[PDB]
Design a protein around this nucleic acid. Structure first.
Lengths: 46, 77, 94, 103, 62
RNA sequence: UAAGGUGAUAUGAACCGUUAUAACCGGCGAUUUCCGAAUGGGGAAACCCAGUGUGUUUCGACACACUAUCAUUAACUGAAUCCAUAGGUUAAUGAGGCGAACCGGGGGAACUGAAACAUCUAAGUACCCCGAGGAAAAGAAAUCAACCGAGAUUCCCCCAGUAGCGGCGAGCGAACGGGGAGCAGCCCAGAGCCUGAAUCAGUGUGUGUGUUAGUGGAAGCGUCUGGAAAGGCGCGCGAUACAGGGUGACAGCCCCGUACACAAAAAUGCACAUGCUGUGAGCUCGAUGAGUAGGGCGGGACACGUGGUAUCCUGUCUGAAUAUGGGGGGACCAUCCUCCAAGGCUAAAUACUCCUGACUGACCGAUAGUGAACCAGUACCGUGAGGGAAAGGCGAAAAGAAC
RNA sequence: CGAAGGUGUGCUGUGAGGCAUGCUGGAGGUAUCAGAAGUGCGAAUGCUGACAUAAGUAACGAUAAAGCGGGUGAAAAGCCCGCUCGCCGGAAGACCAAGGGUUCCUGUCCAACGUUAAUCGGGGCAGGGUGAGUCGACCCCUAAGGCGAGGCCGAAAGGCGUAGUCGAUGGGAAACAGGUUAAUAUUCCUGUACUUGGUGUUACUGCGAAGGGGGGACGGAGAAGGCUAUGUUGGCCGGGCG
RNA sequence: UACGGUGCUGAAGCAACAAAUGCCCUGCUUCCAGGAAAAGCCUCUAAGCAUCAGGUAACAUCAAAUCGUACCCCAAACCGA
């Protein structure tokens, strides 16, 4: 059965990666929040 | 953005009150208009998005003065 | 023209292994560990100056670091660049 | 400003080797000294083929707290406390009892 | 060694630095093999190099 | 500052060092890969690809600098179009991004309460957005008061759950006046005289006093139990030091400290003192903020829900007088009193703690206390935003059990 | 000369409780009278951990299938070698993309992991292994679409979009056969090739773009004909005479 | 012969027939539903430069960097604990 997650690296990056996040204000905010939290992996970026 | 260039009139929020006093948020836009103003000193038309009040002000003072004021404020025309 | 200083920095070590040995013996090709940033030409230059030996050609590759586990904690070894440097016929290297 | 040092003869104030004496062998950063012949332990040394160690019950010198030893003044025939003072633009230790400089 | 190396020219310094670098390289070469049984040497050499660099910087625009 | 060192799990190896460039600590420097505002262009962050110029070359190539955008100012250039302007190319200066709370402004809910619900409440709260500062905002009466007077703003206690507002329901809720904290007033609308007169900012110098390493720093022995004494029992001594912590059980006198007394080559905060740069004080004459005040229509703010509703703000349409004048005194008028709007600046008392140091606790002591005493915002879960654990203790000493 | 805590015993109070003491424990406890409360648990399909029950029960994951000999070993139904047997064969074979990221190869170890055992393993530990001018990416070009100087628009945030600049899943130069490693190969070696750049040359002599034109450059279905991959048979060559 | 393999050696190496859904074929025939773009590539000149550069001609030499390359890939290695 075709399950929901069907990985594709480029797609992932474009969607969720650092640059995408940077591009918008909300993305930036998210990043900031993550930083505040103390996340080790700030984004999906490898 | 709906802003009189002479006066600085922006939109302001407010309410529609009904007969049953049902407040609902609304705006009050200014009565803006893009108008070519003849500038006698420079001998050219300067277009300005201005309120009717702005126009009145201009009439009162002189366009030149208004222009000067605008310049002082750091506003292009 | 590569700078002397740069050249010295390029070459990290000789690589000892069965394959390397074979290369040395049969094909007249030395297997070096080099700086990860070191390009082929630079490597060649280094070889020529620092070992005093004519170079035919340099093949490089990047070796990826193995992931290991020291007790409970996970940790990755560093990547490093390997270079097969083929010396010209009759060139004997100390 | 460390009152006990490498080559000082000291006397032990407390423990199993209390009253005994011995030259400080070396002093550790942890605030402990190892004194010659004082605090002894019979370690069971595990043999290793490399490094030429046979492995046996080796009696070695364990550390002792610096607080537990005291610098011995040979003149008084007793343990003393150490003070610090400047003689000829140079800091030196002295025995509190009798006020003489440590040399 | 810095007080001794301070009393030198730029050219002189450069040559010295080069020599040091060479030495370091040699050590590295040896180290990789089973030749070098004096590890501290490497540490020393790097330090020396650093010192030389510092001196050079001091000389040229400081 | 030193006789010991080369951070930790974590030993070892190879070494350095011992009276002074070992190590350690502090000031000022130097170096400071790539990504990131990221800024030479691009991009699937930590990668890809340039251009220009200046130097070098063993002539294969190297090196190192510059090259974002916007704003502002300047220079040169420059359309339709004659002059111009738009535009264009350079140059200089500034900005950009991040950050706990507090602060001002622009927008702005609903659950809920009203024992239903729509006015109302929740609440100008949550949240989003812009901007700033160490605080911000406000601030020098077109203010109150009551025929007596007070004298800018801010903050605290009262006044008072009063007067009011209010489907006169639920609820909301002042002010006057009083007591305090702190107190400071100035300039431009403009020209005359006199000319450097107070004050403020930047910036050197000097003095004082912090801060960033540090230094000295008192006095205890015997004996019994015991694995060990700091405990018991004796007899002493210090105390401007009996804070606290450690040390083989509970130590004023073993150690580190503590009281107390001193310390800075260098950097730097704050006070005054002083030099330089800009800034103009005092005097006389005036002048005295117009699409403004008011008004109509619509909204919002004032405790005040349009009500008999003063006052403030303005989206809309109007529109004075201008000191012989105008504003206010809670509809409105008359009298009196009181103030001078339509330009600005302004310390203090007030708000907060991402962070630094010191000290305290009828606060917790591992299911508690932070989510996190432990390599935790980790593992793990989730496309992602996001969620998010568990897990402390040998012994005094590894003497961690040779054979 | 043994604190709290743990665990027995005895006594005692109307009760919540209290006192004493043996063992364990190895360092803290605290009268009295006051003071303050995270002050008392059997229940909340309460929360967390631990441990039961069913129960040594069901199951051990395709009904493609095993058997024997030898080996190694502490031990072999399962590992290695061998000979049989059986199953797939438009796949259950071979090679890639995507995705994973060392699982590859060698040695070594069998606690845990493997639904049993395990000497074996995609498990543990150590070491080794990925070689390109011509394969792919990068690179040049663009599609859908994205971003977008100025710009237009919008309370703010921001929206749309020109010039541009990104964006493959499409267009764009070039390599083949054999041999080799325990593990790489159109990458190493052997042979035989090709490409498009510079630089220098001699020979010639109109070169030059952000522009013009051509080209690149394109649908579905159908029909053949010519071919090759590949296969079959014969010939040939080597071996065979059951 | 370390039973893994290593080194040497090496005959013939033709023909016919059959034959793709692969190639000629981005072709041809036909149909209507009428079938990317841009660069590389060829060519034309403009401003320009002018007896220089640039172009094509062979020949010589140098050049081709960087990153990927193991292994699984209808699966015990990817998505399904």
């Amino acid at each position: 059965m075709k399950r929901t997650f069907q990985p594709s690296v480029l797609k992932r990056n474009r969607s969720h990666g650092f640059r995408a996040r940077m591009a918008t204000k909300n993305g930036r905010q998210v990043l900031a929040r993550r930083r505040a939290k103390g996340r080790a992996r700030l984004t999906v970026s490898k | 953005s709906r802003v009189c260039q002479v006066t600085g009139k922006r939109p302001v929020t407010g309410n529609n009150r009904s007969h049953a006093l049902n407040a609902t948020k609304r705006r009050f836009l200014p009565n803006l208009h893009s108008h070519r103003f003849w500038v006698e000193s420079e001998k050219r038309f300067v277009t300005l998005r201005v309120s009717a009040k702005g126009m009145r002000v201009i009439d009162k003072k002189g366009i030149d003065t208004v222009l000067a004021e605008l310049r002082a404020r750091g506003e292009k025309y | 023209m590569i700078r002397e200083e740069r050249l010295l920095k390029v070459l990290r070590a000789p690589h000892v292994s069965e394959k390397a040995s074979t290369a040395m013996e049969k094909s007249n090709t030395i297997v070096l560990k080099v700086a990860k940033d070191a390009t082929k030409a630079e490597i060649k230059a280094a070889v020529q100056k620092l070992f005093e030996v004519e170079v035919e050609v340099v093949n490089t590759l990047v070796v990826k670091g193995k992931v290991k586990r020291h007790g409970q904690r996970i940790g990755r070894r560093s990547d490093w660049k390997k270079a097969y440097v083929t010396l010209k016929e009759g060139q004997n290297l100390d | 400003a460390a009152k006990i040092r490498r080559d000082d003869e000291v006397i032990v104030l407390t423990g199993k080797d209390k009253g005994k004496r011995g030259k400080v062998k070396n002093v550790l950063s942890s605030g402990k000294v190892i004194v010659e012949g004082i605090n002894l332990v019979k370690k069971h040394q595990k043999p290793v083929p490399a490094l030429n160690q046979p492995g046996g019950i080796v009696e070695k010198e364990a550390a002792i707290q610096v607080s537990n030893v005291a610098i011995f003044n040979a003149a008084t025939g007793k343990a003393d406390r150490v003070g610090f003072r400047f003689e000829d633009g140079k800091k030196v230790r002295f025995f509190k009892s009798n006020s003489e400089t440590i040399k | 060694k810095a007080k001794e190396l301070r009393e030198k020219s730029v050219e002189e310094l450069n040559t010295e630095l080069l020599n040091l670098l060479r030495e370091q390289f040699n050590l590295r070469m040896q180290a990789a093999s089973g030749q070098l049984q004096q590890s501290h040497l490497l540490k020393q050499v790097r330090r020396d190099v650093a010192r030389v660099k510092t001196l050079l910087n001091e000389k040229a625009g400081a």
